Design a protein around this ligand. Structure first.
Ligand SMILES: [Cl-]
Ligand SMILES: [Cl-]
Length: 237
């Protein structure tokens, strides 16, 4: 349960893995086997804000996403107010149904909702919209607490968004940022290779105080993950 700094190690629950990040923040992790590679991790976040819990990124599947809700009931014992999912893809949207069944309000980039059916995903219930500088329109993100939503520009996909957690110095780059040892940009099937670099860089500028970068396929890293990701993307153009 990691109650204090002398109880450590990731918590295994079902097939899921949870790692505490800051006092109110955890990374949730699920796995799906992929041709030729094998098991691939997909990370998302759980934020405790006051008397509610906020989730970013469901798991790969409905039944894994259900497990996440269960773990929250056991370990945090708080209601889940809302969830924000970061683009329409199985790794971040696979479990929308489970969130919905649980009666949990869901939010995504309007564009992610427009693409969901074509990407084989269930759309979120609410749509976020963004200014030209990339920050979310606050009226579209009511009651987001510490979550600061930023759309960096096309990237891993054209709809990808990102989230800072105010006060924790943690920024979630999702599929857009890779860690500093990464050998490639991962899955580019949907990517905008022209704007990727600028988008990665825009993310770094949106959260200039983040000391912890959380991404989809790897353990959290330093800001060196932004820099390195941008250099890799520079090679795309
Ligand atoms: Cl990826
Ligand atoms: Cl992906």
């Amino acid at each position: 349960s990691n109650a204090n700094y002398m109880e450590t190690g990731d918590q295994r629950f079902g097939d899921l893995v949870f790692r505490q990040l800051a006092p109110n923040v955890w990374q949730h992790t699920s796995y799906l086997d992929m041709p030729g590679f094998g098991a691939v991790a997909s990370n998302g976040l759980i934020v405790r804000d006051g008397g509610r819990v906020l989730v970013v990124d469901t798991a790969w599947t409905d039944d894994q996403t259900a497990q996440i809700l269960n773990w929250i009931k056991q370990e945090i014992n708080l209601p889940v107010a809302l969830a924000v999912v970061t683009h329409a893809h199985q790794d971040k949207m696979g479990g929308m149904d489970a969130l919905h069944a649980a009666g949990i309000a869901t939010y995504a980039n309007a564009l992610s909702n427009q693409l969901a059916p074509q990407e084989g995903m269930v759309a979120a219930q609410h749509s976020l919209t963004f200014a030209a500088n990339g920050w979310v329109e606050p009226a579209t993100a009511p009651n987001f607490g510490p979550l600061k939503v930023f759309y960096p520009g096309p990237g891993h996909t054209s709809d990808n968004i990102t989230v800072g957690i105010d006060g924790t110095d943690i920024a979630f780059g999702g599929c857009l940022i890779k860690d500093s040892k990464a050998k490639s940009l991962g899955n580019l099937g949907d990517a905008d290779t022209e704007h990727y670099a600028a988008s990665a860089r825009a993310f770094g500028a949106a959260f200039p105080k983040a000391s912890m970068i959380v991404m989809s396929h790897s353990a959290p890293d330093s800001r060196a993950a932004i820099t390195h990701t941008a250099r890799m993307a520079d090679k795309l153009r």
